[PDB]
Symmetry: D2
Subunit: 303 residues, 4 copies
């Protein structure tokens, strides 16, 4: 391994070009983003054989300073004329390789810094404010891009992936976990009706990298739509395990978005411990936080 | 000082009695809570002169185990027939003092663990799910209660306060900070149009402690309504400082809720640093995260 | 309430005047501080009735920008000629009130950012490095100071407190918790031998605030020495509860430092849960992390 | 991709067999581990093609509950008779594959939960306590192991890696960063003397995986010794960049441990920003925390 870069490059852009005309799906109202506020956290990694002596000899002649990579990213957010993080990453990568011929490979991660609308009273009625936004610490879109310079000096995207991170969903009933191995190590009771609490990170790849950019919004798959599919499928399914749930979410995603090649899931189980089983005159129960250990699952569904 | 207790007592109740009929205000749509899921994190502190020898002699005869205080709280969430955290705290406190006559004082903090609705497709259209909820890491309601046992054996609430915590609001324009002291220590440039980013913790006290419980919802002041007032006032105001903004929010709150005695604010400034001042063919700018130091303000408005 | 200020003012100073000339105690080999590297995180709060219209009218005429407060603190660390955080706070507080005649009250907190010694081979042997330090995320010293301006423009310290924060100690045997109340809320078993894990925050006040500054260092009480008393007493004591332990720690502190007036403790119980009790041919056991709820105690011992 | 498992399996063991018989190096006085207290946080991942229908059909017949994986790990810490985390992972992995014939692959990570010695006065003198330990939040050792079942039911280790995580080192002088690219993206000044602050994650692989287990301890490479090389080389080197430094650290590690095949570094730059350059009658300066963006480097040195 030999690479170096800059992490936690925050950049907030006001009035990016709006994303509009995204083909809708029945699980989600999403059709686009106004982009009054567009926040992203970028990580940049660059490699190349010509970086060797920066390590072996302490020679900085071909070191682009990591601080300069941060300026590069923030200046390029100001000049980006597109409408998605995925497209922003391509713009940065192509511009960076064009600028710095001694770099053979660039890898970029962009994470949305999300904001939500708020209520303001305008002319006697509540409406979404065009000025005041709430910083959200819940789920967020992500994007990843790797680009290389070939021997013939052409540039090529070697990997692209979009995602949704930080989704935390609890379904209060309609979930079982039964029928698992019972042996000397098993103490977990079977549960016919648990309040399944799952953390979800979902990532997708497109058949055609072009479609990730949003230049034609009809082919763009938004993280918002993925979120809404996940909640709808969770609601619809009498789940039999997290494994069973995530497979079904992936199938739905790939049915709705035929331009996608695959969907990958990283899920964790955070289901609460039950404290009170029966409350007189109620269907209610009481639960509490479990001990730290958490189950997890990782799975790819392909088209 | 002499007290002891239990912190991080999480308790999640399904199907609490709904809060309904809360008097609405024009800044907020809020009228109540369905309470399909009711999550709270409680902290309990108890004191009393009879606890001395637990410290000075290691005598545990009059020590209610902190673990037992946790069972007490979680069992009482199962039996609570009310509709608010404030009322839940009163129920716990009155029951605890009634049970344990050697305790002279109880102090309780309850923090909402908030959940948001999600979309599910039912009968061909998206609707809010009654089953699947999103755990939110954004703003949340809070409540605080202190209760004592008097010499004549009556119980009395000595302090009550409700609040909203973790609100993070950014207004992209319509904010100035000018006219402050310029001397040998001043390097901050005056800014006629900054994207003010404020964190807000707002706390209120009622003229009549009865009104905090929600038993008569007409007199209950919900944290949701406070949030919506704060966003509306922020939108409406060409702010001149955070100080100026929070005073105006407090005035509005006290105008809308005449049953309130006071509102207290803890605000912090997290405004981003500007990177790109002018973008050709756009009203947009680029910003980034500042260095760690943050300004803060603390202020009470009274009725 | 009315005040404002700046939080997370980090400041790192090299080659502060060393602390030497301290008075030793049996429980601690502490003999001073080299101060090659001196890091502090400072919070400053200021108030005064002349600040009202900064809130009520948006008038910034008498507002010292919080950014300027940060500059003030950082510049004063560069000129500070003393040897303790407590002295640094006094230097800042007196300087700030002399500069700003309309401020009536200043409150400061300083928290040490601790570093540990590392070792290097040079000149034929391994020895403590004068250049390379390890940043520590464990316990650290604290200081608190409040100063006011009187009507005659004299300045008075109105409260001072020193402390030790973030100490996490586990004693593997020699601790009991038995004899507590057993009623309908009690499910905790009696334990004649538990591996008590406590978090300790210890704060002390001096009879004469001058002794806190280090100008006559033989009268200074160092956080390092408090730490060493705490670990020694924990070892020496067959503990009957955390309450029992902290009283005995406080007694020893007050015996060793007759110039202190009191010592205040905030303790938390983080004891692990037992998994395996009997290991063949071993005195070992296996434990794991508990659920989140934690007991706590708050207790003052006075001289 | 298809696998599932359990994360944050904390396990604390008292009186593990001590590690002794280690081979020393000039840079480190490390001579073994007492193992009065041995804490580990374990992540386990399992896969196998027979797990498919647990995802595609909700069939839990071949699902080992993740809760049971936690039990397995904790119980195996109680029976483990070795002396290293690396050996513990091998014990767990071999045991798990022998138990569960339908699992084809297991991946494990163990992270040390470190404790530090404390001292107490007893029997007339101050000495290291055999009972009281300080939980440390600084650097810690790590281990990684992957094991597979072949068609003939033999088991093979397919990858092993050891490491040191969380090391944070600041060198106050004797570091330069000069000579880097100066173009339209460069605003960073050349610095002939900076207080370089690096975070280091160092990982090593052995030529023969058996040497990782500690069974013949003279061939074991301890994280403590790696830590001490890192601090010594940092002190000894007039650094020209972090890249320069980590190559020299890796060279020294490979020279001191000829049984290693390679050493991999993940470094981060957290160097503070300068505030005050010239202090009267002192060699000191004042620095503060930077904005969030951090440079990083990833680099392998091979034997
Ligand atoms: O959904 C689940 N999958 C699992 O693998 C598991 N193990 N314990 N609980 C579980 N729940
Ligand atoms: O709103 C603000 N109030 C302040 O007191 C301040 N100081 N710097 N910036 C500021 N902004
Ligand atoms: O030391 C203890 N004090 C307590 O009050 C307590 N309660 N549960 N466990 C406890 N341990
Ligand atoms: O050591 C360094 N390496 C780098 O690549 C770098 N970039 N900015 N500062 C730096 N320091
Ligand atoms: Na739609
Ligand atoms: Na209304
Ligand atoms: Na000395
Ligand atoms: Na030894």
């Amino acid at each position: 391994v030999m690479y170096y870069g800059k992490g936690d490059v925050f950049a907030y852009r006001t009035y990016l070009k709006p994303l509009t005309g995204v083909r809708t799906i029945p699980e989600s109202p999403f059709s686009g983003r106004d982009h009054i506020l567009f926040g992203v956290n970028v990580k940049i990694s660059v490699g190349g054989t010509k970086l060797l002596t920066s390590f072996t000899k302490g020679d900085n002649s071909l070191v682009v300073a990591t601080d300069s990579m941060k300026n590069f990213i923030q200046k390029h957010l100001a000049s980006y004329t597109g409408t998605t993080i995925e497209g922003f990453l391509e713009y940065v990568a192509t511009s960076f390789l064009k600028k710095y011929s001694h770099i053979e490979k660039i890898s970029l991660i962009g994470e949305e810094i999300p904001f939500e609308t708020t209520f303001a009273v305008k002319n006697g009625n509540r409406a979404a404010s065009e000025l005041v936004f709430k910083k959200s610490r819940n789920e967020y879109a992500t994007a990843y891009l790797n680009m290389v310079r070939n021997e013939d000096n052409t540039l090529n995207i070697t990997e692209q992936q979009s995602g949704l991170a930080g989704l935390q969903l609890i379904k209060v009933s309609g979930n079982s976990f039964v029928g698992f191995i019972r042996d000397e190590y098993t103490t977990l009771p079977e549960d016919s009706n648990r309040p399944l609490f799952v953390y979800l990170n979902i990532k997708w790849k497109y058949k055609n990298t072009e479609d990730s950019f949003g230049t034609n919004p009809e082919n763009y798959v938004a993280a918002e739509q993925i979120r809404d599919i996940a909640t709808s499928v969770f609601h619809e399914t009498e789940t039999l395990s997290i494994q069973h749930l995530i497979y079904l979410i992936g199938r739905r995603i790939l049915e709705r978005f035929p331009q996608l090649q695959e969907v990958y899931f990283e899920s964790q189980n955070h289901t609460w411990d039950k404290i009170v089983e029966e409350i007189p005159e109620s269907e209610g129960k009481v639960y509490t936080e479990p001990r730290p250990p958490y189950g997890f699952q990782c799975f790819t569904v392909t088209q």
